[PDB]
C-alpha cells in the first residue's frame, strides 16, 4: 500500500489529471448518471486510501482502472477529456507495472 500512495500522488499531480480530480457533476454533464453506473475519481480513491479502506493493491488498481474505463465509456477518444484520460491510463499502467 505504500506504492498505492506513491502512484496516487503522482496521478493527482499529473498535468493530465484535471478531469479526474473530483467526482463528475451529473447536474452539469448531461447523460452521465444514465451512462456511468459506478463513478470513480482520484478524490474518492484518496478518501478511501486515507480512511484505511483498501485491503490489497488489487482493489486499489481496480478503482484506478475504473476511472479510465468510465472515461472511455463516456468521452470520445478525440475529446479533450478522452485525450487526457488516455495519457493518464497509460501513465498508471506504466508505473503500476514497473513496480509489480
Ligand atoms: Mg481493463
Numbering used by the authors: 1799 to 1898
Question: How is this structure described in the published paper?
Answer:
Chromatin remodeling complex NoRC (nucleolar remodeling complex) interacts with the rDNA promoter regions of silent genes repressing rDNA transcription. It consists of TIP5 (TTF-I interacting protein 5), also known as BAZ2A (bromodomain [BRD] adjacent to zinc finger domain protein 2A), which is the largest subunit, and the adenosine triphosphatase (ATPase) SNF2h (sucrose nonfermenting protein 2 homologue). BAZ2B shares 29% sequence identity with TIP5 at the full-length level and harbors similar domain organization. Both proteins contain a MBD (methyl-CpG-binding domain), also known as TAM (TTF-IIP5, ARBP, MeCP1) domain, AT-hook DNA-binding domains, DDT (DNA binding homeobox and different transcription factors), and a PHD (plant homeodomain) zinc finger adjacent to a BRD at their C terminus. Our crystal structures combined with biophysical and mutagenesis data demonstrate that PHD zinc fingers recognize N-terminal unmodified H3K4 tail, whereas the TIP5 and BAZ2B BRDs recognize H4K16ac and H3K14ac, respectively, with specificity pattern KacXXR.
To gain insight into the recognition of acetylation marks by the NoRC complex, we solved crystal structures of the TIP5 BRD in its free form and in complex with a H4K16acK20ac histone peptide and two cocrystal structures of BAZ2B BRD bound to H3K14ac and H4K8acK12ac peptides. The crystal structures of free-state TIP5 BRD as well as in complex with H4K16acK20ac were solved at 1.76 and 1.65 Å resolution, respectively. Interestingly, both TIP5 and BAZ2B BRD contain the aromatic “WPF shelf” at the ZA loop shared with BRD families such as the BET family. However, in the BAZ BRDs, these three aromatic residues adopt a closer conformation compared with the more open form of BET BRDs that creates a wider binding site sufficient to accommodate two acetyl-lysine side chains in BET (Morinière et al., 2009; Filippakopoulos et al., 2012). On the other hand, it has been shown that the tandem PHD finger-BRD modules of human TIP5 represent an independent unit that interacts with H4K16ac and triggers the cascade of events that establish the repressed state of rDNA. Zhou and coworkers reported that inactive TIP5 BRD mutant at the conserved tyrosine does not repress Pol I transcription and suggested that interaction of the BRD with acetylated histone H4 is a key event in NoRC-mediated gene silencing. Isothermal titration calorimetry (ITC) data suggest a preference of the TIP5 BRD for K16ac.
